[PDB]
Amino acid sequence: PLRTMSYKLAIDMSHFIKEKGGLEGIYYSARRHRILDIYLEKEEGIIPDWQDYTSGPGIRYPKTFGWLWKLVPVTSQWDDPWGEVLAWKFDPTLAYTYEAYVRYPEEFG
């Protein structure tokens, strides 16, 4: 059944993936991004309108609170607009700290 991403939704999910040894330390590509967007839709019927991040540079944080995965730095056309490398990493602080509007409040609206 279809459904837009909610908090408890994204929340419970974030762990479900970590518990399945997913994403942690895996390298990012604009291709792999959509690869994720799709898993949620085919397996969990989640409207992929959710997955978004901060331009940066430096660390990239999710524009969907409750999401507990952040992009951290360490060519191709799915490469990085900031020429940096990015890999997924878990962080529970993002469940109680909207790092997004914290550091990049200007990227809303």
Binding site: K20, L23, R32, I35, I38, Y39
Partner: peptide, 16 residues
């Protein structure tokens, strides 16, 4: 082909 081409992609992320 549809469920496989989907799965092999999941693999890149440690799921499947």
């Amino acid at each position: 082909a549809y469920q496989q081409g989907q799965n092999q992609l999941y693999n890149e992320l440690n799921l499947g």
